[PDB]
Design an enzyme around this catalytic site. Structure first.
Site, PDB file in Angstrom:
ATOM      1  N   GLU B 171       1.646  -8.636   4.201  1.00 43.18           N
ATOM      2  CA  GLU B 171       2.509  -7.990   5.246  1.00 43.18           C
ATOM      3  C   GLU B 171       2.386  -8.747   6.571  1.00 43.18           C
ATOM      4  OE1 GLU B 171       1.177  -3.914   5.282  1.00 43.18           O
ATOM      5  OE2 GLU B 171       2.673  -3.343   3.702  1.00 43.18           O
ATOM      6  N   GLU B 338       4.261  -2.449  -3.462  1.00 44.94           N
ATOM      7  CA  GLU B 338       3.344  -1.298  -3.346  1.00 44.94           C
ATOM      8  C   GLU B 338       4.198  -0.027  -3.440  1.00 44.94           C
ATOM      9  OE1 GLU B 338       1.183  -1.731   0.359  1.00 44.94           O
ATOM     10  OE2 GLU B 338       0.646  -3.841  -0.107  1.00 44.94           O
TER      11      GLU B 338
END
Lengths: 704, 705
Positions: B171, B338
């Site tokens: 991220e 995710e």
């Protein structure tokens, strides 16, 4: 013991529904009232909007001369004919998504500039925002009162009309909360100057407390802008105190005017502060009313509860609010003046099956009365709505009096309350835990809030690390109070201001969430509490300053505490619990002479001790935790168990919430499932196997 | 036409579960893998934490010499034995609620000050937050890659190992975003100065655009503090363009390093942005990847979906996110790297009955693969948990490998997927509505965001009134997209940057949510769209400026629009809908020339018109609405019906959401009840079928042909 409303000399659960006559087809007024009575409700509640009845300057219509829905007199008559009591709310502010917040258009056009709330540069803040103590505003308010108050006076219960209570204005101070902006109208600032002269007497006294360098009170300017210096913090602190006095001056003027009409009914006010379905800001709004609550035992403050949904995400908010109001207003019942029914916002759904559980949870959590807001939907007349044609959605009744899903939920809950009220209202919970409410931590609506975009309070610039709003929201409200409720430990809250030592001796523990500042009176109170035999839990800081950030180490010295503040890993161990995440790098490291070390940093420095002081016990934790891990629930559980406090029941599923309410004769067990899971569990005192739906409840009665 | 994963030339639904070997007793690794495989999952996913394996500087353990759970090599071998493919994620950052976000303690203690992200004062923002292009950071990262990458290379699918995919870092920007401050490190400031000199060539050209008076590039400083002038806005705009190049340089350096080990597997990255169960800021984060996604066709971005609950309060977040990723990454399947399983936060519950509905809704909303995060709970060894000892709760398996409530929900969903994937992956929704994604409105992470500590952007100081973050959050994400989903109108999102006109002609309507600024290329594209036969809906503003807030009236002139901006009541009437609440007092008042007036202020001034232009249609509304009243849904419905777009189904309960997915063989009807009400309703394709649906639940109907 308990405080509750009374009817015919017996406990009475106040069940009111909000029905805005000015937003409903008058052909359907009787139908709305009949459908409200048919749910078991006893009272109806409405605003009487100034803008709606003074249609032009000195032209009043209360009889439907100009619009059938201006027939207030007929509405009152229908309340009497349909055997409902009436709560009236004539403003002058009503808010209620009504254009200009209920003030007449003709008034706002006519008022001089000096009648408006002004910014620090003398500009009008908002065309609908008056200065509360403006001569011109109060003159026009008084002329509105001269016309509406004789009507209210005539129709009190005394005179076998229906009127039993009246609200003064609406959410005094709300526009300062919503904007984070103070009124700097010179008349306000003159009253602030007088408040400061009154408080300090001499510029030398002020200068000594603030560390200012004024030659006279003439040098003194109202605070504005970001707080950079401890002197700015001091000036802003007293500006908050001043507004609490100013709101008391306003409501006192309205109250004395109202009493002049022989209106002897119960007077009310209402407290907002729910945001996105949680209420961690509402105690800040309670704190704005501190001076009113001190000076008017005859004004009942009620809560505006807006949960939006009912789950573990917000389960703790209503109880904490109810407990803090009980602390601040001990001689009146806790009631919800605005008790969510449907939704103000179309896109924010209010499900009947959620609100039904919220209504039963509210009973568990000590509510003594409520006003369903909104029982009836409204249609804004004649353009008068701030936001759209429709006022509320998913109510009990639509504006045309169609029954909606919530109607049958309200009837069911009301039937239970009517069956049980004689006994239920006289029940309390057995709290062995007391949690302190320190009002000065909450005095920040102008400098730090959930609604204030740009924070004026940055405590790191003042040489501090514990921000009072972070402490009161995350360590207290969403931390300790949420954790106790989740663990099914009863607590009470106590206002530490002018607090009677004798009332603290009832409890086995007192919990104080402390920043680095605390006044001498509170440091002395806590000192005496422990020395006389009290068990104190204090974290995350022993205070060393007073409310003006000047040295005050009474509690530290009285308790023989020494510490250094040192940086370390966020995780500590406490009472053998490893990996307890704490909010701050900086922690208090305690000298352990005559103490037992019970908490340790990653390098084994002592950041918590227990100690005997006089006849009492002290537990000090030099670190901040709320409820963001299972270790936090383990630590709260261990702390409660230091003084052998037990839950009322063994319940097989730890994620079931329960409340035991008792008197000598009756016990109610409220089981609350705040989870999206069907749960089956059994219970016994510290066959008995029960199944509860998602987001649902079960109430058991036991005779003693 | 659909993009999907392929195994052995057939559609394959990627079903992965996250299992942290480093947080599980190694004697139970096999049991976790067997129980994951038994759900029908084909893949397992894990971080390989740098801190866990480089136990001191230059002391590496991947074989369990110093702690049994450092035996990465055995975990890889067990994945192969249990017929699971493996996704590996070696960082350098992992987040993962791991101390120091996965960076070694010894590293963060040794690094010099210059390796950290710094504030405009020169102070370290966070002791675990490095500057990505720090020379020291990259030298240690490379030494970690030197030890972990040969292991990953050896165990790739092409060498008969189980490893099919690898995530680069984690991220990118998330640590900076959560800090609420931007990076003013001196490597950063010097690369920024080179960026500006390359962009503008001469200080005179820079001065002409910014309306500044610099004597030389040496006088230009990295923008800091609040935006007070249009020239400040310009400086920060280029600063945003610079950071998108900076993140592309970071990932480029990692990719080039990885490739040097003979690692030819699919590379991934993962997108943050869910906050408290909604994702209105996620589009801002995805916009920070604009230059990576343009330069790296071989890096597949996936979404990190964290709904927390499943209700009307957040129903629109996952679909809007899936549609925006498709817009930015049209040549790869939309997948969740995710995909919430359990909860990272003890106090934020994750109910199996919520997540089961989220999983089915994700299928309705076009998801083509996912990684359940976390399939297995972990226990942190050796104090490595950032926030406590336990890693995740309410997962499919507890850390001991016991089945929990979520396991049966995941088996149920996976069973439906495996039965149907051959058809389901090939299905499309029929979207007649296209919504434009104008990336510059999202380029505000330095100046305006939900997380930024300091609001630097106040458009009123610039003589503007339409804030790009308000527009993209409330008018587009929580407004138009939420409204279309609620009304059960299918939409697609298209990136307007280098957008091919042929990719817009398929739609009956193009909807553009516009601020007062828009680049000349996009103003020209929209002009040609309408002239050539397009139907355009545009609000709340005809733009009149470009991205540097200089005059650009291309679209206004091409559409023959005249307007004045005037203050009035927030309420307007539009298409006969009274008391439509609008966001601003200021509105555009249009001349009625060669048009039909369709919206009026409280003074009955014209604040919306419809007109025919070339072969196309234009509808312009000079006022802003999202979805904060019933009138807004009425207005969106009226606008859609201007071009006779119909829902696929007549459904008797307007609060039921549905999606029809079909290919040549099969039709799937997904019904979603996002409300706490048992609903009984009837439906028919536009004799009716009756359905009863539980609260927060779903139904799926398959039709053959």
């Amino acid at each position: 013991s308990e405080k509750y409303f009374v009817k015919n000399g017996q406990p009475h659960f106040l069940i009111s529904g909000e029905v805005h006559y000015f937003r409903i087809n008058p052909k359907l007024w009787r139908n709305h009232l009949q459908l409200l009575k048919q749910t078991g409700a006893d009272t109806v509640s409405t605003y009487i909007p100034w803008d709606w009845h003074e249609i032009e300057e000195d032209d009043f219509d209360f009889e439907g001369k100009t619009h059938p829905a201006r027939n207030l007199i007929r509405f009152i008559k229908l309340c009497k004919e349909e055997n409902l009591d009436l709560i009236v709310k004539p403003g002058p502010y009503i808010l209620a998504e009504y254009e200009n917040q209920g003030l007449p258009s003709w008034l706002l056009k006519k008022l001089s500039k000096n009648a408006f709330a002004l910014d620090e540069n003398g500009n009008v803040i908002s065309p609908d925002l008056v200065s509360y103590l403006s001569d011109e505003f109060l003159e026009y308010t008084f002329k509105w009162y001269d016309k509406v108050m004789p009507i209210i006076s005539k129709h009190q219960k005394e005179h076998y009309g229906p009127i039993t209570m009246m609200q003064l204005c609406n959410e005094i101070g709300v526009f300062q909360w919503l904007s984070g902006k103070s009124d700097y109208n010179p008349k306000v600032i003159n009253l602030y100057k007088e408040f400061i002269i009154q408080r300090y007497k001499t510029i030398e006294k002020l200068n000594s407390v603030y560390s200012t360098n004024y030659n006279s009170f003439d040098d003194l300017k109202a605070p504005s802008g970001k707080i950079k210096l401890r002197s700015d913090y001091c000036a802003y602190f007293d500006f908050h105190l001043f507004f609490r006095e100013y709101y008391n001056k306003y409501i006192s003027i309205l109250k004395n005017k109202i009493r002049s009409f022989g209106i002897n009914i119960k007077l009310t006010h209402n407290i907002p502060g729910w945001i996105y379905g949680n209420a961690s800001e509402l105690p800040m709004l309670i704190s704005t009313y501190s001076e009113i609550m001190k000076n008017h035992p005859d004004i009942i403050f009620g809560l505006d509860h807006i949960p939006e949904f009912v789950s573990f995400r917000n389960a703790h908010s209503d109880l904490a609010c109810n407990k803090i109001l009980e602390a601040m207003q001990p001689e009146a019942p806790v009631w919800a003046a605005e008790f969510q029914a449907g939704t103000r916002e179309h896109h924010v759904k209010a499900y009947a099956k959620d609100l039904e559980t919220f209504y039963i949870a509210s009973l568990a959590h000590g509510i003594k009365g409520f006003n369903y807001y909104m029982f009836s939907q409204g249609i804004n007349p004649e353009g008068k709505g701030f936001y759209g044609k429709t006022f509320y959605f998913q109510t009990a009744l639509d504006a045309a009096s169609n029954k909606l899903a919530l109607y049958d939920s309200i009837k069911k809950v009301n039937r239970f309350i009517r069956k049980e009220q004689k006994d239920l209202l006289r029940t309390n919970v057995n709290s062995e835990i007391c949690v302190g409410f320190y009002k000065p931590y909450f005095f920040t609506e102008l400098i730090s809030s959930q609604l204030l975009k740009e924070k004026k309070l940055n405590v790191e610039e003042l040489g501090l690390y514990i921000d009072p709003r972070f402490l009161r929201e995350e360590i207290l409200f969403n931390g300790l109070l949420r954790g106790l409720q989740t663990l099914n430990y009863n607590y009470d809250v106590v206002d530490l201001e002018n607090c009677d030592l004798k009332s603290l001796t009832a409890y086995k523990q007192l919990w104080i969430t402390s920043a680095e500042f605390m006044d001498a009176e509170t440091q002395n109170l806590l000192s005496e509490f422990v020395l006389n035999g009290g068990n104190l839990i204090l974290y995350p800081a022993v205070p060393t300053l007073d409310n003006y950030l000047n040295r005050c180490e009474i509690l530290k010295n009285n308790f023989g505490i020494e510490f250094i503040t040192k940086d370390s890993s966020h995780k500590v161990s406490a009472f053998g619990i490893e990996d307890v995440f704490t909010a701050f790098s900086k922690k208090q490291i305690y000298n352990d002479t005559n103490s037992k070390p019970i908490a340790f940093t990653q390098e084994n420095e002592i950041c918590g001790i227990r100690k005997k002081i006089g006849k009492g016990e002290l537990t000090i934790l030099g670190f901040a935790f709320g409820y963001t891990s299972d270790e936090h629930l383990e630590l709260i559980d261990k702390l409660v168990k230091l003084n052998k406090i037990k839950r009322e029941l063994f319940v097989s599923d730890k994620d079931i919430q329960f409340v035991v309410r008792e008197n000598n004769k009756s016990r109610y067990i409220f089981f609350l499932n705040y989870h999206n899971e069907r749960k089956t569990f059994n219970y016994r005192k510290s066959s008995e196997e029960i199944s509860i739906a998602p987001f649902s409840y079960k109430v058991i009665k036991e005779n003693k």
